Amino acid sequence: LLGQGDFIRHLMDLLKPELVRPATTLYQHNLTGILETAVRATNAQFDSPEILKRLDVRLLEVSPGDTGWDVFSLDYHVDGPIATVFTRECMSHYLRAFNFLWRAKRVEYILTDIRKGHMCNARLLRSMPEFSGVLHHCHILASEMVHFIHQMQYYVTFEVLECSWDELWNRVQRAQDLDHIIAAHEAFLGTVISRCLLDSDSRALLNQLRAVFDQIIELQNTQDAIYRAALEELQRRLQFEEKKKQREAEGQWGVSAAEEEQEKRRVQEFQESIPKMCSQLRILTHFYQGVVQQFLVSLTTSSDESLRFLSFRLDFNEHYRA
Amino acid sequence: MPREIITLQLGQCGNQIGFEFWKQLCAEHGISPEGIVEEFATEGTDRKDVFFYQADDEHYIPRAVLLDLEPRVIHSILNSPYAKLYNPENIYLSEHGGGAGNNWASGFSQGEKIHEDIFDIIDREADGSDSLEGFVLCHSIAGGTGSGLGSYLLERLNDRYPKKLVQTYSVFPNQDEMSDVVVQPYNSLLTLKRLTQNADCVVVLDNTALNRIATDRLHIQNPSFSQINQLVSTIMSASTTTLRYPGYMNNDLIGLIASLIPTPRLHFLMTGYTPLTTRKTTVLDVMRRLLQPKNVMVSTGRDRQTNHCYIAILNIIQGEVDPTQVHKSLQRIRERKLANFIPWGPASIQVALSRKSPYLPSAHRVSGLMMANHTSISSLFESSCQQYDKLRKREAFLEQFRKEDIFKENFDELDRSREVVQELIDEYHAATRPDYISW
Amino acid sequence: MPREIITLQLGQCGNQIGFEFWKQLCAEHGISPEGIVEEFATEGTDRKDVFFYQADDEHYIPRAVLLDLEPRVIHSILNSPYAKLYNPENIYLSEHGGGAGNNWASGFSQGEKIHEDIFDIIDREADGSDSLEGFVLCHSIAGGTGSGLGSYLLERLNDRYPKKLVQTYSVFPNQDEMSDVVVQPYNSLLTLKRLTQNADCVVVLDNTALNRIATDRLHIQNPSFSQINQLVSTIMSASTTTLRYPGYMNNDLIGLIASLIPTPRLHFLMTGYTPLTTRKTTVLDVMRRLLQPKNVMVSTGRDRQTNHCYIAILNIIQGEVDPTQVHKSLQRIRERKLANFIPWGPASIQVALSRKSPYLPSAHRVSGLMMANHTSISSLFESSCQQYDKLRKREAFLEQFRKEDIFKENFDELDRSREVVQELIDEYHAATR
Amino acid sequence: YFLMDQGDFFVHFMDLTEEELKKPVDDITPTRLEALLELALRMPTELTLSGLEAFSFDYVVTWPLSLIINRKALTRYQMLFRHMFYCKHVERQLCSVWISNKWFAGAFTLRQRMLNFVQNIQSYMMFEVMEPTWHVLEQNLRSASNIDDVLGHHASFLDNCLKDCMLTNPELLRVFSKLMSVCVMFTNCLQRFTQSMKLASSFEATITKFDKNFSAHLLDLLARLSIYSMASVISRLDERLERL
C-alpha cells in the first residue's frame, strides 16, 4: 500500500533508468537485484525477514513493446496455510490497485522533478528576461496542474488508506472467531477498491485521469524544449564572452563582435520563436483546462459525495463552474 | 536513497539556535548525549538516518557543521555534554577574533578568506553521504558577521553545487527596538538580496513576535535569548516531524517546499504553532486557532488598508487523529470562509497527518504547525526597507562598509539590494491581484 | 457563533470596577486566578467564553483593556493574583505622570494623542474575535480624567465601527456627597452629551444610591468605595447571567437591548438588584421589593412634573421558579398597576428565568435584578442640570479649560451639550404624552 | 435542538440558512446544512398542513430507540421547530433592522409594537406548552413501567402539544402567518428604503399602510383568541393595553 514512501521513492528512482527502455529490452534478473538492494538500503531491512521473503518482484506483461514502466510489477507470493485466504482472486485486485497507485506516484514524481528543474533553471534565466516571461506562464500552468494532481492524489490516498486499514483493523480485532475474521476482512478489503473505486464510471474518469497524465509528459517535453533553448542562449553568451576575453584577444574579439552583429539575428530568431513557444504553451494550457473541467463536471454529476468534496478542495475559490 | 540535510550554524545567535535544534533532535530520537544508541531510541519507527548519519558503532553523528569567526561560542558549545554528539571533523574552530564586529562586509570578506577552509569540510561532509536532499543554514541576519559569511557561502554553494535544496534559518532582528549597529538593516537587506538571489524556501524568524509570545505565552517579564532559542528550536524541530514518519506519504523536503512555492523569488513562508504553554482539542480547533492572528511567529507592520491573500496554507498535525475529523475540518473551515486564495489559481488548505514518537514525552493529543505563503511579510520588508531608506537617507555609519574596500569603492551593492527587494515587494503586490499572470 | 464584548475600564473608578467585575467573572466561571481551567471548578456544560478567549491550555484571557492616565491604578491592578488571567499586551500604560487630574478638558485632549494607539489596540483585539457583538465600557463620568477620556473614546469608536453595539456602564457621581471638583457638573454634562450623541445604550449607575445603600441598606456605617465596588460588581455579575449561562430565548445581547430602547435618543436605562445582600420565598414579593426605591441602586427622586411611568421592565431571575408564580405575580402587579405604562403601553414586565451556577455557594433560590426605562432619571439629569446651571451662572471654574485650548475660545459647546440634554429631558416628559 | 435548548447554534444556522431558503430546493447545496450542523456542536392533509417544507432538519434513531419514538412524532417535532424557526427569523430580522442612531421617518412605535407582540407570543407559547408538558411527561415516564403505558404517556404529551402551540386553533388559520408575512414585507421594504437613502412621503404612506394591515391582522387574531382557543396570551397582551 505504498506506506513506505522512501522504499517506493528509491524504487522508482532506480526504475527510471530501466523502465524507460522498451519492455522487450528488460531483464527481471537485474530487476530482482534492484529490488533486494533497495530493500537492504531502506528501512524494510529493519522489518521481519518472513515478510521480506514474502515479497517478490515480477515482470507483468502490460505493453507489447512499450516502456518498462508499464510491465513492472510486484507479486508478493504467499501460499499454503500461510495466508490461505485471498484465493488468488483478491490479490488480483491488489495488483490492479498497485498498478493504479504506481502510475499515480510516477506522475507525481514527474511533477516534482519538473518543478525541481524549473527552480534550477530559474537562477540561470535571470539574465534573459524575454525567456523569463514565457517561463512565468510555463511555471504558472505547471504549478496549477501540479497542485491539482497533488491535492487529488493526497485526498484519495487519505480516503482509501484510512477507511480500508481502520475498518479492517477494527473489525478483525473485534471479530471473535476466524469465520468472521476471514469473511469481514476479505470482503471489506475487496469491496473498498473493487467496486467503490472501480466501475464503468471509474474507468470513464480514469480516461481523463490518464489524459492529464499524458498532459504531464507533454509539459515535460515542452520543458525540455525550453531547456535546450536556455542552453542555446547560454552557449550564445558563453561564446560571446570567450571571443571577447576583454580585448586580450583584441583582433579576435573585434572580428567576433563584428560577426555577432550578424549573430544578433539569432537572438531575434529566438525572440520570434518566443511567441511560437508562448502560443504552443497556451494551447496546451487551454486543452488541459478543458479536459480538467470535463473531468470535474463528469465526476461531480457522477457519484460519491466524498470525491465531490475532494473536488471542492480542488476547486477552492471557485475557478470551475464553466 | 535517504537524502540528508546539512546544518550551517552561523553567528552567535545562529550557532545558539542551531545547537538548540540539534539538542531537540537528539531528544526526539532518544539517543544519548554522546550519540550512542539507547534501548528506547532504535526500537521505534522514527528514521534517524535523515539528519544524523549512522556510524559503525551505532553513533548517529549529526550532519551539522559549526562555523564561527570568534571561538568563544565554539568553546561554550564544546563545554556542553553534547560535544560528544558531534565529530571534531564536524567542528571548525574560529581563527578570527571578535567575530566580524557584526558587519555584513566584514563577515562576507572573512568568508571569502576562508573559502576553501570551509569548502574542504563541506565537500568531505557531502561525499561522506550517498545523496543529499539539500542544505539548512541557521543564521542571524542581525549579526553582520554571520550575515556576510552566509552571503558568501550561499554564493559559493549555489555556484559549486546547483543540485541541492537551499534552506536557511534567517533570524530576523527585532523591530521592537533599534540596535547599536545602525547599519544592520543594510546588512539584512544585503542578506535578503542574497536570499532572493539564492534561497529557495525561507522560514522567517522575527524576534519581535518571539519576544511577544515569550512575554505572554511563556509569561516572562524579560525574556532571555536562551529561553527564546529553546522555544524556537522546539517549534522549528516540530517541522521535520513528517519527514521522520515514513509510513504515509513520500514527504520529501524538496516536494513539500515545491507544493507551495510559486516562484524562486516568492519563496517566503510564515510560521505558527499550537499549543503554546509555559488542553482538550479536536481537529477543527487546530486550524480554527491557527486562523487566529495570535499564534503566528511572523509579524507584519501596521497595514490594514491593503488586502493580503494567503497564497498557500499547509498544516502539520502531529498526534492521534481520525480521517473523518480532517475531512470535516477542511470542509467546515472552507465553508466558514476563514481564508482566501488567488482567484486565477485558486488552491486549498493542505494537511499533513503524523503521529508522535514514543520517546517524545507526550502531554497533549495534537500539535499543529502552520506553513503559510502570504503577503503580510512584505510589510516587514517595507518596515526594513523604510528603515533602510531613512538610514540611506541619513547616509550614516557607512564607514563600517568603508573598512572593507569592496563597499568603500561603491555602495551600489546596497542600491541593487534595495531595488531587488522593491521588485520583490511589487511582485507580492501584483500577486495579490489576478493580473499576476501578466506580470 | 457566540458574540463577545471588549471591556473598557477607564479612570480610577472604572478600572476598580473592571477589576472587581473580572474577579466576579472568574468566580462565576470557576477558573483559576491564573485563568487556567480547574480539575474541580471547571466542568459545567455552559459557555465560559463570552467576554474572553480560551487558550490552548484553556486560559480564558479576558477581553480587557484598561486606560487610565494614573499609572498607580494600573500598577496596583497588575499586583493581583488575577494578573495571570489577563493578557499583558491588552493593557496600555500611561506615561504622562499624573494625567488629567480629574479634568474633562485635559482627558479629552490627551485622548487625542493616543487616539491612533487606542484605535490600533482595539482593532487588534477585535481582529482576533470572530464575531465581536459590540463594545462594553465601564468608567466614571465624575472622574474628569476618565470623563474626557471616555468622551474622546466614544467619539473615536463611533467613528471607527458604526456596526458594533455601543453599551456603556457609566458610574454616576455621588449625590449623597458633593464632589470636590467644582467643574464636576460641567464634566458630567459633557460626558452625558457624548453618551446621548454617541452611546447606543446607557445604564445609570448612581453613586448617590450606592452610597446610601452601603451606608444604610447593607447595615454598615462605612460608605467605603471598596464596598460600593463590591456591590456594583455583584450587580454586573447578575447582569450577565442570561448571557454567560445559556438560556432559552433572548440569549442574544441584541435581543435583550433592543427591547427597551424604542428611539435612538432614549438610551438611558435604570437597574435594581434583589435580594439585597449584607422567611419563605415567593416570586411576586421579590420584584415587589424591587418595586420599592429602597433596594434600587439609582438615586432618583419621585418628583412630579410629568407622569413618570416605566416604559418597559425586564426582570432576570436567578434560581428555579415555576412559571405559574411568575404569571400570577405579573397579573397581580398589573391589577395593582405597580408599573405605569405609556398611553399605548406595548409591553409588560417580561420575565427571564436563568439556571443558577453550581460553582457558586447557593444562598438564594430567588435572586432578581431589575431592568427598566423610567423618565424619573431625567430628574437626576435635571438635578445635575440645575447644578450645572448654578455652576454655569457662577461664571466660574472655566479658567481650568482656558488654561488648555479645548475651552479657551468659546464655551458654546458646554451650552450645546446642556441644550441636547435638556431636549432629552423634555423628550422623556413627552414620552408619557 | 428539536425543543431548542441551544440557540448559539441557531444564530449561525440563521446567518447561513437564508442564503438558500430564499431559493427553490434541489437548486441549493444540502451539504452546507450538515457542514453547519457539525459546526453547531463546536459551541389528513389538513392534519399535515400545506405549508410544510420539503425538508429543513435531519435526525436519525436506532432500532431500540425506534421501538419507542415513531416517525409521526418526529414529524410533529419538525413542524413545531419550523414554526419556531419562522418566529425567530422574523424576530431577528426586526432586531437587525432596528439598529439606527439619532426624525420624520417615524414608525418606531410600529416596529416596537410588532416586536413586543411577536416576543410575547414566542415566550408565552414556548413556556406554556413545552415546559410543563415536557416536565409532566418526564414525571409520568419516571412513574411508569408499562412500556405500552410509556407509549401512551408519550402519545398523550405529543397530542397535547399538538392541541397547543401554533395549532392551538387548527382553523385559525395561520392568520398569524399572514401577520408575520406582512411584517417581513415591511422589514424588507424598510431595508430597501434605508439602503436607497444611505420618496420619504411614499415611505410614510407605506408605513401607514403597513400599520393598517398589522392592526387588521392583530384585531382578527385577538378576536379569534377571545372567541375560543385561550386569552392567557391576550392576558399578557393587555399597541394598546386595552381592547377596541
Automatic annotation (TrEMBL), chain A:
It comes from Sus scrofa. Residues 224-251 form a coiled coil. This is Gamma-tubulin complex component 3. Residues 1-320 form the Gamma tubulin complex component C-terminal domain. One of its GO terms (molecular function) is gamma-tubulin binding. Keywords: Coiled coil, Cytoplasm, Cytoskeleton, Microtubule. GO terms for cellular component: centriole; centrosome; cytoplasm; gamma-tubulin complex; polar microtubule. The lineage of its organism: Eukaryota, Metazoa, Chordata, Craniata, Vertebrata. It is found in: Cytoplasm, Cytoskeleton, Microtubule organizing center, Centrosome. Belongs to the TUBGCP family. The keyword Cytoplasm applies. Its main location: cytoplasm. GO terms for biological process: cytoplasmic microtubule organization; meiotic cell cycle; microtubule nucleation; mitotic cell cycle; spindle assembly.
UniProtKB/TrEMBL annotation, chain B:
SMART domains: Tubulin (SM00864), Tubulin_C (SM00865). Residues 249-386 form the Tubulin/FtsZ 2-layer sandwich domain. One of its GO terms (biological process) is mitotic sister chromatid segregation. InterPro entries: Gamma_tubulin, Tub_FtsZ_C, Tubulin, Tubulin/FtsZ-like_C, Tubulin/FtsZ_2-layer-sand-dom, Tubulin/FtsZ_GTPase_sf, Tubulin_C, Tubulin_CS. It is found in: Cytoplasm, Cytoskeleton, Microtubule organizing center, Centrosome. GO terms for cellular component: centrosome; cytoplasm; cytoplasmic microtubule; gamma-tubulin ring complex; nucleus; pericentriolar material; spindle; spindle microtubule. Residues 48-247 form the Tubulin/FtsZ GTPase domain. Its main location: cytoplasm. Keywords: Cytoplasm, Cytoskeleton, GTP-binding, Microtubule, Nucleotide-binding. One of its GO terms (molecular function) is GTP binding. PROSITE patterns: TUBULIN (PS00227). Tubulin is the major constituent of microtubules, protein filaments consisting of alpha- and beta-tubulin heterodimers. Gamma-tubulin is a key component of the gamma-tubulin ring complex (gTuRC) which mediates microtubule nucleation. The gTuRC regulates the minus-end nucleation of alpha-beta tubulin heterodimers that grow into microtubule protafilaments, a critical step in centrosome duplication and spindle formation. PANTHER family: TUBULIN. Belongs to the tubulin family. This is Tubulin gamma chain. It comes from Sus scrofa (Pig). The lineage of its organism: Eukaryota, Metazoa, Chordata, Craniata, Vertebrata.
Automatic annotation (TrEMBL), chain D:
It comes from the Eukaryota. It is found in: Cytoplasm, Cytoskeleton, Microtubule organizing center, Centrosome. Residues 1-238 form the Gamma tubulin complex component C-terminal domain. Belongs to the TUBGCP family. Component of the gamma-tubulin ring complex (gTuRC) which mediates microtubule nucleation. The gTuRC regulates the minus-end nucleation of alpha-beta tubulin heterodimers that grow into microtubule protafilaments, a critical step in centrosome duplication and spindle formation. Plays a role in neuronal migration. Component of the gamma-tubulin ring complex (gTuRC) consisting of TUBGCP2, TUBGCP3, TUBGCP4, TUBGCP5 and TUBGCP6 and gamma-tubulin TUBG1 or TUBG2. TUBGCP2, TUBGCP3, TUBGCP4, TUBGCP5 and TUBGCP6 assemble in a 5:5:2:1:1 stoichiometry; each is associated with a gamma-tubulin, thereby arranging 14 gamma-tubulins in a helical manner. Gamma-tubulin at the first position is blocked by TUBGCP3 at the last position, allowing 13 protafilaments to grow into a microtubule. This is Gamma-tubulin complex component. It comes from Sus scrofa (Pig). The gene is TUBGCP2.
